[PDB]
């Protein structure tokens, strides 16, 4: 009953900071090309609008359950990564679990985008799945480079091995995995260079081309959690937060600073770079970040 309230604390904090992180993305992309743009508390009002309609669509019996499964999977992703010391479980937060549970949101946001039935949703799913094909070639090598440099997989036995000694973006056989993660994060998010699972403008909107009221609200929740989960997975592995309430709140605050830190370098790349053809997106994630992560993988062994 206490782990239930603690998990409710983590999911409601991840909501009320992940939406603010997406609003920070909107604010920085507004200032990146000379505009005030929205207030900081903007996508909260997006979600609050999208649950206030009076009609919906519901094309099929599976059209509901796919995106609801996407929200359940993206909540399951953030439940294992150690959000500060307050973790509902730290015994098993293994690398392969969190790495695969980022991809399952890219199922359910697309598995229920297929049930509508559209050439726009079909070619959006066509251009979304080649990413998830191509991005796992430098992603797996980054995970092996994290693996063989430490040995342990329980993610509480990694932040302990960071706060004992050293940082983790240092020690160059592990830094070459971080550049591979810094490039794969824009694809795993849906930011502008490797945008194409969102693609606003070239195709209509790809997978989320016609969802409706409540379904777009669940998508905004899922997209904010995908943001927060992949950013917390990058920070609790390659950066390490680790660490009384005046110690715990400051621990979560410096964790939030390192959340913004990779999120800050995810935006500066992700506005000055145009959208990528999916035929080149399959060709790019095998040339440069694969050989970088492969040099990191043979230098971690």
């Amino acid at each position: 009953i206490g782990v239930f309230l603690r998990a409710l604390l983590i999911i409601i904090y991840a909501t009320f900071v992940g939406f603010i992180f997406m609003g920070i993305i909107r604010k920085v992309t507004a200032r990146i090309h000379r505009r005030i743009g929205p207030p900081i508390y903007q996508p909260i009002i997006d979600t609050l609008k999208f649950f206030g309609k009076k009609e919906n669509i519901t094309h099929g019996l599976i059209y509901d359950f796919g995106i609801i499964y996407a929200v359940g999977a993206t909540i399951l992703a953030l439940m294992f990564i150690p959000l500060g010391p307050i973790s509902v479980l730290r015994a098993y937060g293994d690398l392969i679990l969190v790495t695969f549970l980022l991809e399952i949101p890219m199922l359910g946001i697309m598995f229920a985008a297929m049930s509508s039935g559209n050439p726009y949703a079909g070619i959006g799913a066509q251009r979304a799945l080649l990413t998830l094909l191509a991005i796992q070639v430098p992603l797996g090598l980054a995970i092996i480079a994290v693996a063989e440099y430490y040995g342990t997989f329980s993610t509480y036995e990694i932040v302990m091995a960071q706060q004992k000694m050293g940082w983790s973006i240092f020690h160059l056989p592990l830094l070459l995995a971080a550049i591979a993660y810094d490039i794969v994060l824009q694809a795993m998010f849906g930011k502008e260079p490797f945008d194409i699972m969102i693609a606003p403008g070239e195709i209509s909107l790809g997978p989320m081309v016609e969802f409706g009221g409540k379904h777009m609200g669940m998508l905004q929740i899922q997209h904010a959690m995908a943001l927060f989960a992949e950013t917390l997975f990058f920070s609790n592995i390659f950066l390490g937060g680790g660490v009384p309430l005046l110690n715990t709140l400051a621990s979560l605050a410096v964790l939030l600073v390192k959340q913004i830190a990779v999120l800050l370098i995810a935006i500066f790349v992700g506005a000055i770079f145009p959208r990528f053809t999916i035929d080149q997106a399959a060709k790019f994630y095998w040339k440069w970040p694969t050989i970088i992560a492969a040099i990191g993988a043979i230098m971690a062994s």
Partner: peptide, 23 residues
């Protein structure tokens, strides 16, 4: 069970009525 709890909390944010008309 964290999946089936997470699917319940996901169903809480969806199963709210307000017009779910099929098309």
């Amino acid at each position: 069970i964290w999946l089936v709890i997470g699917l319940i909390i996901a169903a809480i944010l969806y199963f709210m009525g307000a017009g779910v008309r099929k098309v």
